[PDB]
Structure formats: C-alpha cells, structure tokens
Structure 1
Amino acid sequence: PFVNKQFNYKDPVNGVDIAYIKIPNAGQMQPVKAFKIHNKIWVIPERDTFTNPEEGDLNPPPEAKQVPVSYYDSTYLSTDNEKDNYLKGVTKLFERIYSTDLGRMLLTSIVRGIPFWGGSTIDTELKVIDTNCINVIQPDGSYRSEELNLVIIGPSADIIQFECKSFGHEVLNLTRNGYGSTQYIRFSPDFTFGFEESLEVDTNPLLGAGKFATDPAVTLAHELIHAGHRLYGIAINPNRVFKVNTNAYYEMSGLEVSFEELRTFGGHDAKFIDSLQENEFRLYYYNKFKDIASTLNKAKSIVGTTASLQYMKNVFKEKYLLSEDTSGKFSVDKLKFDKLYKMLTEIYTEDNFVKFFKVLNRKTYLNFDKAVFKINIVPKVNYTIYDGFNLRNTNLAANFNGQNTEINNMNFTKLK
C-alpha cells in the first residue's frame, strides 16, 4: 500500500527495508536487492529467473515458436536506471490503487492475509511454512528468515506474461484450502496493452474503432485481486474452465476462460457463473475456515522464537474474522464469513476498479489485447496518482483522450 518512504534503487542496504534477499528456490540463486515498500510487501526490480528453475534465462524461443500475444527483450530491466524507474513506477501504481476506497480496502486485506502456520506434522503445534518467507542477508553474510505476503517482481522471458504465482506444498493445496501462501506477482509498469473501444454515441461507426491503452493501475489491481484470493486460500482451481456459451453447440468449438479469471474480472463476465456453483464454493471454503478455527483451538505449542502462540492465534483470528468466546475458543460466524468472502470475490474485481478509477477499460475479459506499448508512468506530466493518463485540467481529461494511443501518441510507443 502507501509507501511512506522515498526509495531510490541506489540507496544503501540497511538490512531492514532495503537489502539483498534469497527466496525459497531449487537452484542456489545469487541474492537480489529488494525493497520493503510497506508491511508484508516487497518489490524486487529484477527479471524473474529465480522463482522457477525451468525459467532460469531470458532467452527468447525461436521466432516462429513464440505466440502472437507475447514480447521478448532480454535487455529489459538490466540497468540500475531501469530498476530505479521500475521501482518508482510500481510504487506510484500502489499509491493510485491506495487512493481509491476500494484499493485501500484490498491492500488492507492483503496485508492482513498472512499465510496460515500449517507447516507442522504435529496437529497440536503451529509452525510457519518455509516457502512463505524470504531470507534477508545480514552484514556477516548470515541470513534472517522473514515472513511476507506479497512480492512484486519483474517478468520472466515473456515480458507481458503477468501472473500471480506461489510455492506449493507436498500435500496441502495452499491457494485453495483457506491457508494461503506468499504471492509473487510478475509485473511491469513499463508496458501496457492496447484494446479497441467505440465511444461513438451515434450510429455511424463507418470509420472503425478507437485505439486505447489499458491503465497499468488496473492491470496491477487485477493481479492483486488474484493475490487476495490466494492469500486467503480461496482461489478456484485453474482446471475449472469455461468455454463461452452465448452461442455454443457441443463439446467446445472456441477459446476458453477459467472461472478464476472470470471471477476476478467481474461485471457481466462473472454473472455467467451459476449462482448454484457459487454457493457450492462458498460453503466449501466456509468449512475450510472452520477447520482452521479447529486447528487453532487444538494448538498447544508453537515453533519459533519471537511470537507466542496467543500472538499468532490473534493474527489468524483477525485474518479470518473468527469469533472468540470467553473460553478463548474460536468459531466461524456464517455472517462474517459471507461478508469477507463476498468482499474478496465479488467486491474486489477488475470491473469495480475501473469504476473507481473512472478510466476506459476492456468491457469483457474476452476482449483480447491488440498490441503492446512502451510507456513511462514516472514523470508527473505523463501520469498521476489521481488521474492516471487522463490529466485533469487538460484535453487528456476529455473522452479518455489520455488513454487514446492516437491522440496521446507521445505516451505510447508501439513495439508489436
């Protein structure tokens, strides 16, 4: 959320909110300079060649093997100035999101969504799960383990393939059992996508469709919504997909969209999800939350040196909005759960963010992007926390001209 400290990539490491870190990996990675921009949230201005071993290089695939919807440049985010700009761009997008009442709530939910301490083999012992932490290097090369909820990191080979990912477990399905896990968002504020939209009020579209660019704040908000679902362990299995049926015959015949994506987008898209299937999920996760309250009730010991058992129990009472009786026992109140669940799944949506930002955006998740543009959101003359590209007191604040790649062509450089 709000970043109450000016961060310059060049600032010296202080081992607190500026330091070199290592994430739970398979290959002995070399540490990277990271910045803690807010409680539980870090930003790593580096291309992601760490989280997944299979993706340990920025080498682009054969020209004729890379999809039409992609962009490669192994040179992007390699210099200090680029990293500084990346850091400033990410910080600025967080502030824009935070400036909205919806954004402030989402970020507050993310910070409160500490991954559950379900790593013990003993059902009466609370223990942190190692992959929900990072290792912060100390002056003596030593490492300090620190819990965190979210990491914003640079994209891997395909620069426009933004996604929210996290480390799995041997048996637990952390993003779907109510526990949650630390989320890593591959993202860049230096590029955006173009889409077609007709603002024509009349009935004479005899000249085509307008060419606009997606506001990066909306794109980040979209990934943060996924992070929210995953931090609270209520993400829908990616295998549960949908084959558009406004007009369908039998056994597919066109592209497909996942339920998780449709839910995250919101609007008419989410309205397609059967109210029955919706309640099925709600009751399922209601019970997962009950199992968590039960685990906390049975806890008799805790691993670690800093936090006491009562301290962590309080952390999770707050996260899951559990009710506590005089005996100190926890329970899940149906009403409270329904409210939290609705907040995370129906209120926090891309469509609702577009409403709060008052910007132009794809009307449907199905509206495929047409191109990729190079941008620079850092300078105040190009983009601001409150108006984005549509600068008030200027022509750009009229008819979303600021997002119009034709009109505001100086802010969008086509790359593909």
Structure 2
Amino acid sequence: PITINNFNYSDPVDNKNILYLDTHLNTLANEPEKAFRITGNIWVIPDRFSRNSNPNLNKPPRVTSPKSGYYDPNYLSTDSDKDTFLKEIIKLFKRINSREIGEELIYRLSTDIPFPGNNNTPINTFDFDVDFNSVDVKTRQGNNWVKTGSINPSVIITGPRENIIDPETSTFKLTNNTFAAQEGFGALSIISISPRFMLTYSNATNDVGEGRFSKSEFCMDPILILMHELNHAMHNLYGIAIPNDQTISSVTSNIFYSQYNVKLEYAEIYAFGGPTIDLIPKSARKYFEEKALDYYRSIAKRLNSITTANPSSFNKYIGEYKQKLIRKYRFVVESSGEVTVNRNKFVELYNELTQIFTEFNYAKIYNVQNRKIYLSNVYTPVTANILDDNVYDIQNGFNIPKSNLNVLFMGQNLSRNPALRKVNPEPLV
C-alpha cells in the first residue's frame, strides 16, 4: 500500500524527499522554493503561487466579482505558516488514503507519469524535459543557487494564488505548443489551494430532516476540496482534460451577490460528477471520449516507434518507460510486440476517470455532508484548526463520535460545531 511522508518545514534537505526547486513558473518566487515529497511523484511546495507578472496578493482595486474572494497578502508568508500548511496537506492525504478509492487516487497520481512529450515531439522520441514536466533542483553555495539536476513531479501542490478561496489546478506549455493534458500525453499539474478555507452551503446531498423548516449551513470537508482538485490532476495526467472553452451557460449566487450568470466548464462538471454530468449533451460527451481515444491511438503508435530519448541518458531506459506507459494507458501488447489500443479497456478507464473518481462519489464513500451540486449557493467561508484531533481527525473528519458530532453530520453543521469559525471578514470580497 501507500504511505504518506511526515515533515516539519524546518527538516533538512536530504536530496531525496526534501529539496529546493525552481519551477520557473512562480512569479512570486525570486529564489528556489523548498519542496517536500508527499509520496511517489506528488510534491508539495508550501508557498503562495502566482502566474501574473508583478504579482500582488492584496485585495483587488476593481471589480472581479461576483466571484467570491478572500485576500490576505500575509497568509503563508512566515515559515511558521508554511509548517502548518505543510502539515495540514499531509494530514489530509492520510485521511484521503484511509478509504480504498482515495488510496487508488493517490497511487495513480503518484505512480503513473505524463507521456514524455507533446504535439511537437518527434514520433520516435521520448522527451523528459518537454514544456514544464521537469523542474530544476538547486543547492546553495556562497550567496547564490546552482542547478544540480532535475526531477519530474506528476503533481505539485502549492499554497493559494491571489484569491485564497478559489483553488485552482493548471498545466503549462511553451508558447508555440498546445496543451498536452488535453491530448493523451498528459502533463505536470500544479494545484494551488488551502483546504482549511472551507466553502459553506445549505443545498446539500444528505437530507438531515430540515426540509420543512430552516435548513442548516454546512461546511465542505477539506478532503473533498482537495480531492476535487486531484480529479483535475487525474484528467491532466491521463491526457483527457476538456478545454476550458467547453462550457454551459448557468447561474449561481456567491457569498454576497444574487443569482448571476457563469460559464460552467465541462472540466468542472466531470471533477464534481454525479447527475450533473447529464448537463453535458450526450453527443458532446461521446465526442470528447472518442477524441481521447484517438489521442491514445496516436500514443500507441509512438510507443511502437521510440528510438531516441532526451536527455540522452534516458536512451538506455526506453524499454522501461515504454512498459510503464503501456501499463498507464492499459494498452495491449500483441504477440508480435506491437502496442495496440483495446477499446473495452479504454472505455472502462475513461469511465473511471470521469465518473467514478468524482467529488460527488467521494462524498458518499467517505460518508460526509457535501454540496448537492457544484454551483450550490454559498455563504460565508469558515475555517478550523484541522491539525487538532479534537476538531478534525483522519477517520471521521469533523464528525467525531467522542465530540458527539457524529449524528447527522453535526460536525460539519455551522450552528452545532463551535470549532468552525467564519473567516476574517476584512479579506473578503
């Protein structure tokens, strides 16, 4: 099985699970960032992250809303903050790992890798440095930092970007390329998030008997906030991500404003899952699945043509990676040795990735209260000291029996659990 590593932010670099990395993507970082290996190819860099030039973490001057936002330029600024964040992420992975589906989710994300290449990679080549799949490992000597090598994370979890309550997962590419995450190859994903900042709602999946009266507000369990993003990472890793331009015009209401229109991305619909998937026209769902199958066929063709690798040191390991990728995509190997795509196996895999590994399904499996739909109306966000086992533990999250909060999800009920507190109102927008 899989085990989650434990760390203190202050723990020494060991050139194995603790290193200093330069992703060449964080506009907030002027020097290498300390990183920790949660397990396998999943790493965490407990720092704020940004993709905007001349970044600013202060509340925006203009109007970016209705989108609910929380801005605090000092969140995660100190080493003390980073240590707490790091431990929160670790604890959440342990809870995710407590159920079989979560163990499988972590196993896949930490074991399978992006195909080494993109649309512009020659068919006979394995490129382990394509786009942003490899990150520099740096060490200090003197008053500077020098590259000593690189690693290939599959997923890097970082702290929030500008808006602390808008978790986001992304892949990156060079200007002249297209997104490999949408073309079968898959690519490295960066998840920017802070699970302890919980979204609140009243339109929930589990009936608690208040239908005819006043319904309680509940918080989202931090593991679902994180697992939701891990679903985007799954789509990105297996190269089946749906372009962000694929949407359905909808409405919802933020923490302040009233019902406003929004373009609901199909990527969000799949990450959430459940009946919501039906919002995507059946013909469109089939279209993207068939498109993915064609990209997979192209990958199988590449696997039958590999003769060189970049960097050259990987040439002697072409067979090893060919086998790893064959297992990832669940391809079949003919007696002749040719790699072929089995439709039955593909359909099963695609279904798993888009309809089984979903937030909606996790809520049922982990037995926690959760929003009924991705666009459930939200209220003021809440937070809690999730590192305190008297507040949140691995087995039951907030719904702890010892606290007498295990009945009807009372642990997640804002008016029944004093451990839950509204976030600072000042940073809210």
Query: Fold match, TM over 0.5?
Result: yes
- SS of equivalent residue, structure 1 residue 277: helix
The aligned counterpart of 1:313 is 322
Alignment deviations for residues 163-216 of structure 1 (CA, whole Å, 9 cap, x no partner): 1011124223212100111000011133111111474537631xx221111101
Q: Does 1:386 align with 2:387?
A: no
| C-alpha separation in 2, matches of 1:191 and 1:122 | 44
Three-state SS of the structure 2 residue aligned to 1:7 is coil
SS in 1 for 2:223: helix
Which residue is 2:147 aligned to? Answer: 142
What CA distance in whole angstroms lies between the structure 2 residues aligned with 1:58 and 1:379?
28
Structure 1 regions of 5+ residues with no counterpart?
Answer: 246-252
Per the alignment, residue 357 of structure 1 pairs with: 366
Specify whether residues 183 and 121 from structure 1 end up closer, same or farther in structure 2 by C-alpha distance, changes over 3 A only. Answer: closer
Deviation at 1:156, TM superposition (A): 1.6
Match of 1:367 among 358, 376, 401: 376
Q: Distance in 2 between matches of 1:319 and 1:329?
A: 16
Alpha carbons 2:26, 2:49 under 8 Å: kept = no
- Number of aligned residue pairs: give it: 405
Matched, 1:182 2:214: no
Q: Tell me by how many angstroms 1:112 deviates.
A: 3.5
Name the amino acid aligned to 2:209.
Answer: V
Aligned residue number for residue 39 of structure 2:
38
Percent identical among aligned pairs is 32
Q: Say if 1:82 and 1:323 are closer, same or farther in 2 by CA, change over 3 A.
A: same
Change in CA separation of 1:377 and 1:122 when aligned onto 2, cut-off 3 Å: same
Cα drift, residue 310 of structure 1: 0.6
* Aligned: 1:279 with 2:280: no
User: Counterparts of 2:375 and 2:275 in 1: how far apart (Å)?
Assistant: 11
Give the deviation of 1:302 after TM superposition.
Answer: 1.8
1:216-238 per-residue CA deviation (whole Å, 9 max, x = no partner) reads 10010100001100111111111
The question of whether the paired residues in 1 share the 8 Å contact of 2:195 and 2:225 is answered with no
8 A contact 1:92–1:385 mirrored in 2: yes
Alpha-carbon distance in 2 for matches of 1:392, 1:410? 15
Aligned match of 1:414: 423
Higher mean C-alpha displacement, 288-297 vs 256-265: 256-265
After superposition, the C-alpha distances for 1:244-268 in whole angstroms (9 at most, x for unaligned) are 49xxxxxxx9433111111211112
Q: Would you say 1:343 and 2:327 are equivalent positions?
A: no
Distance 1:10 1:138 in 2: 16
- Listed as ranges, the matches of 1:4-403 within 5 Å are 4-25=4-25, 29-49=30-50, 52-54=51-53, 56-62=55-61, 67=66, 69-118=68-117, 121-128=121-128, 129-138=130-139, 141-169=146-174, 170-197=176-203, 199=207, 201=209, 204-205=212-213, 208-244=214-250, 254-304=261-311, 305-306=313-314, 308-403=317-412
Q: Displacement of 1:19 after TM fit? A: 1.5
Counterpart Cα distance in 2 of 1:407 and 1:224 = 30
Residues 192 and 373 in structure 1, CA contact (< 8 A), matched pair in contact too: yes
Secondary structure of residue in 1 paired with 2:136: strand
Residues 117, 414 of structure 1: alpha-carbon distance in 2 compared, 3 angstrom cutoff: closer
What code does the residue aligned with 2:172 have? F
Distance between the aligned counterparts of 1:26 and 1:79, measured in 2? 17
> 3-state SS of the aligned residue for 1:223?
helix
Residue 250 of structure 1 aligns with which residue?
A: none
TM superposition score normalised by structure 1:
0.91
Gaps of 5+ in 2: 252-259
Residue 169 of structure 2 aligns to a residue whose secondary structure is strand
Contact 2:202 2:215 in 1 (8 A): yes
Aligned to 2:290, the other structure's residue is in SS state: helix
Distance 1:271 1:122, change over 3 A: closer
- RMSD (Å) for aligned C-alpha atoms: 2.2
Q: Is the 8 A contact 1:13 1:19 kept in 2?
A: yes
TM-score (norm 2): 0.89
